[PDB]
Amino acid sequence: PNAIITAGALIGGGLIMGGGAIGAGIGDGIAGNALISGIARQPEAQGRLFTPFFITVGLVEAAYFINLAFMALFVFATPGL
Amino acid sequence: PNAIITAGALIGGGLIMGGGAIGAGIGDGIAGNALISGIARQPEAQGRLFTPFFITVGLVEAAYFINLAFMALFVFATPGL
Amino acid sequence: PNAIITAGALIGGGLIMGGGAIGAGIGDGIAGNALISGIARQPEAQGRLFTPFFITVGLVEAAYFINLAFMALFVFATPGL
Amino acid sequence: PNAIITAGALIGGGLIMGGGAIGAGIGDGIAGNALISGIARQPEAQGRLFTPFFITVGLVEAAYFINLAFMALFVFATPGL
Amino acid sequence: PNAIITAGALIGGGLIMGGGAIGAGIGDGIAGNALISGIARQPEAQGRLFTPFFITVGLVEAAYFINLAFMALFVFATPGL
Amino acid sequence: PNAIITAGALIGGGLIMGGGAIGAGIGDGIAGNALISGIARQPEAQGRLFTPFFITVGLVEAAYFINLAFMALFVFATPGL
Amino acid sequence: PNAIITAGALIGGGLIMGGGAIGAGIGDGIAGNALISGIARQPEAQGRLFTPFFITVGLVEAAYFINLAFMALFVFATPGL
Amino acid sequence: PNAIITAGALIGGGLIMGGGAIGAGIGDGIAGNALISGIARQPEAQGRLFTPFFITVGLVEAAYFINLAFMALFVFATPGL
Amino acid sequence: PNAIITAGALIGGGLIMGGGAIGAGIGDGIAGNALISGIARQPEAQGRLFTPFFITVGLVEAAYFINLAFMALFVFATPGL
Amino acid sequence: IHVGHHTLVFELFGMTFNGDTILATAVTAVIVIALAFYLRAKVTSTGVPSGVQLFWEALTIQMRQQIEGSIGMKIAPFVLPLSVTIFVFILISNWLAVLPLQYGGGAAAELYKAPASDINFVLALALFVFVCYHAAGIWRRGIVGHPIKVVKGHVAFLAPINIVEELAKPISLALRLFGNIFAGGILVALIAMFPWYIQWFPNAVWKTFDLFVGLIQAFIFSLLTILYFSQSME
Amino acid sequence: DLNVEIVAVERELWSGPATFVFTRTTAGEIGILPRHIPLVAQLVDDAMVRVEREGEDDLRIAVDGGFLSVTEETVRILVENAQFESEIDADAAKEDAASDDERTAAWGRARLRALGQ
Amino acid sequence: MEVEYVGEYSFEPDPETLFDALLPRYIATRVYAALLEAAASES
Amino acid sequence: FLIPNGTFFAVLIIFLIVLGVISKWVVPPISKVL
Amino acid sequence: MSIFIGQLIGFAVIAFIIVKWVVPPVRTLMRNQQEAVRAALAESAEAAKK
């Protein structure tokens, strides 16, 4: 019975990390696209563009971390087992 | 009975958090892309752009937080169990 | 029999919330990207631009809410039970 | 036998509305991005932008509505039940 | 029995409609983005622009219809039943 | 035995149509966005802009067709049945 | 036993082809969007634009082909039967 | 017991290739869109754009082919069996 | 019971790797799009653009392999086995 | 499909060796050595270059331009031979698979299987490049200095991410090359399941594009090696 | 073929037809071949122009803060001051490239770039 | 300068910056034309 | 099949030989040619 | 037997494709570079004579 509970927990944690990976990768790629475009158009602006960047990547990479944390809770401390 | 419901709740919460992370990460990337582009382009605008940026990020992380709350409900207070 | 339907309803509600979160987050990000760019290049135009923006966010948010409703209908008032 | 079909119908309706919400949110975000940017750049044409906007949204909201309808048909009038 | 076949058909039709909704919504939102941007930059072009628009929307909304033609086949006919 | 195979084939065909619809709709929308923007920027280009378009569409419509075939194989001629 | 493996292979091949169709269609649409936009910008570059195009189309269509091969492995030559 | 593991491995490999194909196709399309746009704006840049292009492709393709490798491990040398 | 555990772990690892592939490929393509465009506009900017680029890709790749690091833990360690 | 299954496997020095992969690597090595020796015999500064001279000149010029554009040739003289040899080795390994060396057992067998299809080959090249550019970084920065810069990278507060990206440099560089060729080895096997009268079409279309795919993979491997050197060195 | 005309503020400087024109506008590098869509852009302060003249060799021009216009009829390069590659004094351009004055330094660097560095 | 609306293209970078960088050039060319015409009148 | 083997070294050795030959027979010669 | 033949027909098709559409550009490209280098040697020779 746990069998089924922990199998579902594994699938759910896989879903959590798949969504976190998609969101983190694509959001970081988009923020990096903006940063690279800004540094290419304004070479001297790079110093400034890293504060908006890490804020963006801060919100993006935060979500991933939370997902990762919850995945652990799903996988190593599966609720309702 | 309990095992099946728990496994289904785990998979559903995993779906909730995966979709929430996808939405949060990609929306944060898309909003921070505009923030970085605007700051690059108009460095003095850095202060004026953070209000639209915070409106957008609030709308995105509100979705993320609602999804997180409903995943917590699914996995810790599994309805119908 | 109720356990199978409950697990299916939990998975379906998780799907509804995942899709709603993805759509809401990405649509909010896209609309906010438009708003941020328009307010960067036209500082005084933010008022004009908050009109279409809230219309857009109105259509996006709306969908999420509807999903949030039906997930509840799936989870608390499972149609098939 | 009806429990399995009911769970399958719940999962199918969840998929229907997940896809519908994703499409609606992202399509509305993209169309609203167009509208906001066009109004920001050329406000004098604001009215002219609403005919091609509500058309596009009219398409997007059609796709959502149809899906919602079928979701109902899946969950309340499950075919093959 | 064929109850498993019916549940699989419902899940498959749900996938068909979800994918069709995502594709139609996002694709016609992109096409409408192009239409709105073109009309904003050239408000007198609206007539000319509706020719290519309805072509791409003809391609984007055809894919939806075909899927709706096959989802109906899945749940109402269920060829493998 | 054949019931499980048929249910799996229906789910697989649903996945095939969902992915084909997503790809076709979004790719056709993107190509149509390019076409509409090109025609808006300059009308006389229309005659040439339909050669790259029908090429791109031919690539985006071929994939869908291939999926259209394989789903037709999955459900009507389920391999391994 | 063969029934379960065949159903899983059908679902996996459906995933392979759905992902392949999504990737190929959206990548072809994006590359053809670039091609259409370029041929709008500079028609005389049409012939020069077909070299980077078919390379890009070569890169995505290779992946698709590999996908189409592996699905054929899953469906007709199920490795773990 | 081996049948269930084999079916799960087939589904996992299908997911791996679906994600890999989506990422490969879309990322390659985006990189080739940048390449074609650059060669349209400056047709004499072809030579210098293949270095940052195949770097980008080299990154994108990695995500695909690594996944491909692991599918084989899932499919032909299933970690559990 | 371990058969269900392994099947669930394989499906979860497939989801992890598929999401990682989607995120990594699409984000790397998005960032390399900015890189290629900036090099096309300013060839001399090449060396300048690789500093931010390899930061952003450095994050995106880090989202992939971390997910991969977890997929191994799902399939070779299989927590809860 | 019998994925895996290296033939000519033997054992020596208490460890196993995949004989077929070693044979393919030796064949590629002798082809590259023949090209190099024919160049050496017929390398002309004043006369009209031969075909091999033009090939080697173009490859060396491309890699020298890559090095100069990322890290000065004065700093990186040893990396041009590395890039050229990596490029030619991978290119010849991949292209030798286009020869019709596939027959029927009743499963399909192949006299020459591309060495990159084996994990050992791609892992060996990737780890060699990894050790090489880490040693170059140590030389140009110091034994203790180089690890500090590697961990810090360009952003200090992203220290773990760097430590991952670093470990990602070899793995990807290997697996990116592995799966691309390994996958091909499967497709040709899968296409072998077709009857002869329809097998030639999918096989032909696959391998015609596989020529370009192997060329692009060799180019990418060499280009990313040069890029990693540029990075690890300053 | 392109109708390429380069017009200095003092006088019309060049009017020969061409097959391809090339220059670094303020927002990136650009090339124009016949039937290019209408365009307006600003050449970089140290910009140079390559005109792929159909008959003879290409023409390399150092341009001082010019503007670029593309039209259905002709491709116009408005110029404050320009010099063909044959007229550039290499030593003078080298000396100016190190000048402290922004305008003089930009003009000298443009002359060097047009000459062939 | 008066804006002279009368009864009834692409821009790189955006038309606001290009127009701002062009207007001083317009004033310069008009002053140059004034000087040339003053020289002609003087002769 | 993803587990490395002794062939690893058997490959590396061979590659080194090529790396040696191209290091002297090819690059410096082509180098001086150019 | 059948597999060999079919892959041999495939290789024949590949060879025909490369000979008809890939060999002409590359061989002649190398060829044009060759012409160039030889004519450059020629210009050097002439300058020496001058």
Ligand SMILES: COc1cc([C@](O)(CCN(C)C)[C@@H](c2cc3cc(Br)ccc3nc2OC)c2cc(OC)nc(OC)c2OC)cc(OC)n1
């Ligand atoms: C870093 O650690 C966090 C952060 C969160 C956030 O959700 C953001 C996550 N994201 C960046 C992906 C966050 C949040 C919530 C918002 C809710 C609405 Br509605 C609208 C905007 C919001 N913006 C938000 O910040 C962007 C939040 C939630 C919360 O409660 C759990 N307490 C908070 O206060 C201390 C709080 O702020 C820090 C959650 C969390 O949980 C595991 N761990």
Ligand SMILES: COc1cc([C@](O)(CCN(C)C)[C@@H](c2cc3cc(Br)ccc3nc2OC)c2cc(OC)nc(OC)c2OC)cc(OC)n1
């Ligand atoms: C405060 O945290 C929230 C917010 C919501 C929202 O849905 C938005 C979430 N979003 C960010 C994804 C929100 C909402 C609904 C809309 C419905 C339509 Br139709 C059209 C536009 C809408 N715009 C909306 O906000 C812009 C909402 C819904 C609601 O219903 C129960 N009561 C509300 O009042 C307290 C409410 O706030 C106005 C839901 C929620 O549920 C747990 N918690």
Ligand SMILES: COc1cc([C@](O)(CCN(C)C)[C@@H](c2cc3cc(Br)ccc3nc2OC)c2cc(OC)nc(OC)c2OC)cc(OC)n1
């Ligand atoms: C909370 O409010 C809503 C709104 C809806 C909508 O579907 C919008 C969905 N969106 C936000 C993603 C909405 C709608 C339908 C359209 C149909 C076509 Br065809 C074309 C355009 C449309 N545009 C639409 O937006 C305005 C709608 C549906 C409806 O249901 C029979 N009755 C309506 O009349 C009162 C209605 O408003 C005209 C649904 C809903 O369901 C719970 N609750």
Ligand SMILES: COc1cc([C@](O)(CCN(C)C)[C@@H](c2cc3cc(Br)ccc3nc2OC)c2cc(OC)nc(OC)c2OC)cc(OC)n1
């Ligand atoms: C809201 O109401 C609808 C609308 C539809 C449409 O599919 C559009 C849905 N979309 C906007 C997401 C629609 C349609 C079909 C097309 C087919 C091809 Br091929 C090419 C272009 C098309 N464009 C279309 O409109 C944009 C349609 C379909 C149809 O048959 C089912 N009968 C119709 O005429 C009475 C009809 O209207 C022309 C279906 C439907 O079904 C539940 N309900």
Ligand SMILES: COc1cc([C@](O)(CCN(C)C)[C@@H](c2cc3cc(Br)ccc3nc2OC)c2cc(OC)nc(OC)c2OC)cc(OC)n1
């Ligand atoms: C509306 O009715 C349709 C249309 C189709 C299409 O697939 C297009 C659907 N799309 C717009 C989402 C269509 C098609 C196929 C192509 C194949 C390649 Br390779 C390359 C380009 C293509 N472009 C295509 O049109 C744009 C098609 C398919 C077909 O199937 C045997 N027979 C056809 O007649 C020769 C046919 O042309 C009308 C299918 C269908 O089936 C349910 N019903």
Ligand SMILES: COc1cc([C@](O)(CCN(C)C)[C@@H](c2cc3cc(Br)ccc3nc2OC)c2cc(OC)nc(OC)c2OC)cc(OC)n1
């Ligand atoms: C209905 O038409 C098709 C077309 C295909 C393609 O896959 C493209 C599909 N896509 C656009 C979504 C196609 C193809 C293959 C490529 C392989 C590599 Br590696 C690299 C680039 C490629 N580019 C390709 O098209 C640009 C292809 C495959 C093939 O397979 C035996 N024979 C071909 O004959 C030469 C062939 O060219 C027509 C397949 C197919 O089968 C179901 N039906």
Ligand SMILES: COc1cc([C@](O)(CCN(C)C)[C@@H](c2cc3cc(Br)ccc3nc2OC)c2cc(OC)nc(OC)c2OC)cc(OC)n1
């Ligand atoms: C070995 O590499 C890593 C890196 C991580 C990160 O999650 C980012 C992964 N990403 C790039 C996809 C990372 C992180 C966390 C953040 C949390 C918030 Br809230 C907001 C921004 C963040 N940005 C972050 O980096 C961009 C992180 C995690 C962590 O684990 C407790 N400890 C950290 O500090 C010592 C830490 O920082 C470096 C995780 C990991 O686990 C397998 N391995």
